[PDB]
Amino acid sequence: MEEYRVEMLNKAADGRVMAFEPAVIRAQPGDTVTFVAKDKGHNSALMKGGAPEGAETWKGKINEEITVTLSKPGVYMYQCAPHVGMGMIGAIVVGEPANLEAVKGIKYPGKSKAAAEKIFAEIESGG
Ligand SMILES: [Cu+2]
């Protein structure tokens, strides 16, 4: 088991405002990801229909440094509720992205649509 960290930040290294860093975690089945409240006012919650079938969901409170389990392989699309409209979403890819087509079709409100397009390009082609 590997244990990864995703920081919830107001300002990222690459200039993003309201951002999870890294935006895309590449994990294996059984690994964990812990969210870090480096800046306050953020949360982490799984987006509706943004996980592979039968996967455990999560809905972290504001400033809650929640650790999520990643048993089933696939792409997990999650968001910050306060800043999702500003584009604050992230991805956790577990094993092979089998449900990549399905997660492309979910609801991405506001600037998270452009953020999702950047995330999907990063997973598929690297950049
Ligand atoms: Cu936020």
77 marked as binding residue: no
85 C-alpha to ligand 1 centroid (Å): 10
Phi, then psi, of 84 in degrees rounded to 5: -60, -40
DSSP letter for 62, please: T
- Architecture of the domain spanning 1-127: Sandwich (2.60)
Distance CA 48, CA 51 (A): 8
Give the helix, strand, coil percentages of the chain, each rounded to 5: 15, 30, 50
10 C-alpha to ligand 1 centroid (Å): 7
Distance CA 12, CA 121 (A): 19
- Burial class (CB within 10 angstroms; exposed 0-12, middle 13-18, buried 19+) of 54: exposed
For residue 39, how many other CB atoms are within 10 A of its CB? 14
81 C-alpha to ligand 1 centroid (Å): 7
Q: Report the structure determination method.
A: X-ray
The strands making up 74-79's β-sheet, listed across from edge to edge, are 24-27, 89-94, 74-79, 45-46
Q: Report which of 2, 27, 3, 24 is spatially closest to residue 14, judged by C-alpha positions.
A: 24
Runs of H (alpha helix) within the chain:
100-104, 112-125
98 C-alpha to ligand 1 centroid (Å): 28
DSSP letter for 90, please: E
1 marked as binding residue: no
Q: Report which of 63, 117, 65 is spatially closest to residue 89, judged by C-alpha positions.
A: 117
Q: What angle do CA 110, 124, 19 make, to 5 degrees?
A: 40
Euclidean distance between the first and final Cα of the chain, in Å? 27
Phi, then psi, of 59 in degrees rounded to 5: -145, 85
